[PDB]
């Protein structure tokens, strides 16, 4: 909201590389998703009015399945072929996707949860503050929106290379998607989320009122905002997700980094270069300006 996800603003290389590679089909979903993704940001009491109905959730879950439907579709067909090698290196292509894969569902599923929780919590009270919940809503959404972002690219980047064409690896490719998810549904029955988002909680005719809400919404939010992660766990519900997630994130970015290194080393050797200072931020000394990325905060 200020640097966690704002660092990408000045770094259009992510939107340029994806728009050039993908084209528009996949870039569309992930493109429109980022719009409402950050739009969810709030501050003024207006947030309590929007919480009435799962608006950002319906729009988020709507696009989430879109980018995931187009990516998974083109992916399965992409796995059929790998880089121009087919010998041993291809073995890393199986694990590589495993990382970017778990990263997709992780953030995605985390999205619907952030809303379903934030809404299910406030809707249970209907008479609390907003900042107390915003403090965590800023960082949580910051890392949730940042990950899904830096991931969408780092993931689509590998799909651009696979377009090359392999021989033996062609068999291992199909295995990659099989090593990620099998019994489950892509990530974790995301469909089940589309149902909850519909739940909402209408009153009489103000369950949304986004019309006037959006007015002060962006006004106060952009005005200056009074939170900037002041470390104040109010809901302590959604924070758990980003907390336990941010921890495992290291396992993903790690396998995805070590693999990508050699993965792109075959086709080229400049990716790590532009990515060294053009990926998104590279986590400039820890995360969060104030409210550091809590590991778990116990239970």
UniProtKB/Swiss-Prot annotation:
Record annotation: effect of changing residue 144 to P: Decreased binding to LDL receptor
GO biological process: acylglycerol homeostasis; AMPA glutamate receptor clustering; amyloid precursor protein metabolic process; artery morphogenesis; cellular response to lipoprotein particle stimulus; cholesterol catabolic process; cholesterol efflux; cholesterol homeostasis
Effect of residue 143 to A: Decreased binding to LDL receptor
Annotated Sequence repeat ranges: 62-83, 84-105, 106-127, 128-149, 150-171, 172-193, 194-215, 216-237
Location of the region described as Lipid-binding and lipoprotein association in the Swiss-Prot/TrEMBL record: 192-272
Region annotation (LDL and other lipoprotein receptors binding) ranges: 140-150
Single GO cellular component term: melanosome
Tissue note: Produced by several tissues and cell types and mainly found associated with lipid particles in the plasma, the interstitial fluid and lymph. Mainly synthesized by liver hepatocytes. Significant quantities are also produced in brain, mainly by astrocytes and glial cells in the cerebral cortex, but also by neurons in frontal cortex and hippocampus. It is also expressed by cells of the peripheral nervous system. Also expressed by adrenal gland, testis, ovary, skin, kidney, spleen and adipose tissue and macrophages in various tissues.
Main location class: secreted
Effect on the protein of changing residue 112 to R: In HLPP3 and AD2; ApoE4, ApoE3 Leiden, ApoE3**, ApoE5-Frankfurt and ApoE5-type; ApoE3 Leiden and ApoE3** are associated with HLPP3; ApoE4 is associated with AD2; changed protein structure; no effect on binding to LDL receptor; decreased association with HDL and enrichment in VLDL and IDL; may prevent the interaction with MAP2 and MAPT; changed interaction with APP/A4 amyloid-beta peptide; increased ability to induce APP transcription; increased C-terminal proteolytic processing in neurons; decreased function in neurite outgrowth; ApoE4 is associated with higher susceptibility to SARS-CoV-2 infection in neurons and astrocytes
Positions of heparin binding: 144-147, 211-218
Coiled-coil intervals: none
Disease: Hyperlipoproteinemia 3: A disorder characterized by the accumulation of intermediate-density lipoprotein particles (IDL or broad-beta-lipoprotein) rich in cholesterol. Clinical features include xanthomas, yellowish lipid deposits in the palmar crease, or less specific on tendons and on elbows. The disorder rarely manifests before the third decade in men. In women, it is usually expressed only after the menopause. Alzheimer disease 2: A late-onset form of Alzheimer disease. Alzheimer disease is a neurodegenerative disorder characterized by progressive dementia, loss of cognitive abilities, and deposition of fibrillar amyloid proteins as intraneuronal neurofibrillary tangles, extracellular amyloid plaques and vascular amyloid deposits. The major constituents of these plaques are neurotoxic amyloid-beta protein 40 and amyloid-beta protein 42, that are produced by the proteolysis of the transmembrane APP protein.
Protein name per the record: Apolipoprotein E
Organism the protein comes from: Homo sapiens
Source lineage: Eukaryota, Metazoa, Chordata, Craniata, Vertebrata
């Amino acid at each position: 909201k200020v640097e966690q996800a704002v660092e990408t603003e000045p770094e259009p290389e992510l939107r340029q590389q994806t728009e050039w590679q993908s084209g528009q089909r996949w870039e569309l979903a992930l493109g429109r998703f980022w719009d409402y993704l950050r739009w969810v940001q709030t501050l003024s009491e207006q947030v309590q009015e929007e919480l009435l109905s799962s608006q950002v959730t319906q729009e988020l879950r709507a696009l989430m399945d879109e980018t995931m439907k187009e990516l998974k579709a083109y992916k399965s067909e992409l796995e059929e072929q790998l880089t121009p090698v087919a010998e041993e290196t291809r073995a890393r292509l199986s694990k590589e996707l495993q990382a970017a894969q778990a990263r997709l569902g992780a953030d995605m599923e985390d999205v619907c949860g952030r809303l379903v929780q934030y809404r299910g919590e406030v809707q249970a009270m209907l008479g609390q503050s907003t900042e107390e919940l915003r403090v965590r809503l800023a960082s949580h959404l910051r890392k949730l929106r940042k990950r899904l972002l830096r991931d969408a690219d780092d993931l689509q980047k590998r799909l651009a290379v696979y377009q090359a064409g392999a021989r033996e690896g062609a068999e291992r490719g199909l295995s990659a998607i099989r090593e990620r998810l099998g019994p489950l549904v892509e990530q974790g029955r995301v469909r089940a989320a589309t149902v909850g988002s519909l739940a909402g909680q209408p009153l009489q005719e103000r369950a949304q009122a986004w019309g006037e809400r959006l007015r002060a919404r962006m006004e106060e939010m952009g005005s200056r905002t009074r939170d900037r992660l002041d470390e104040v766990k109010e809901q302590v519900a959604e924070v758990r997700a980003k907390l336990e997630e941010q921890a495992q994130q290291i396992r993903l970015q790690a396998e995805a980094a070590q693999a990508r290194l050699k993965s792109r080393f075959e086709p080229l050797a400049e990716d790590m270069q532009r990515q060294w200072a053009g990926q998104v931020e590279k986590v400039q000394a820890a995360e969060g300006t104030s409210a550091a990325p809590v590991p778990s905060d116990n239970h």
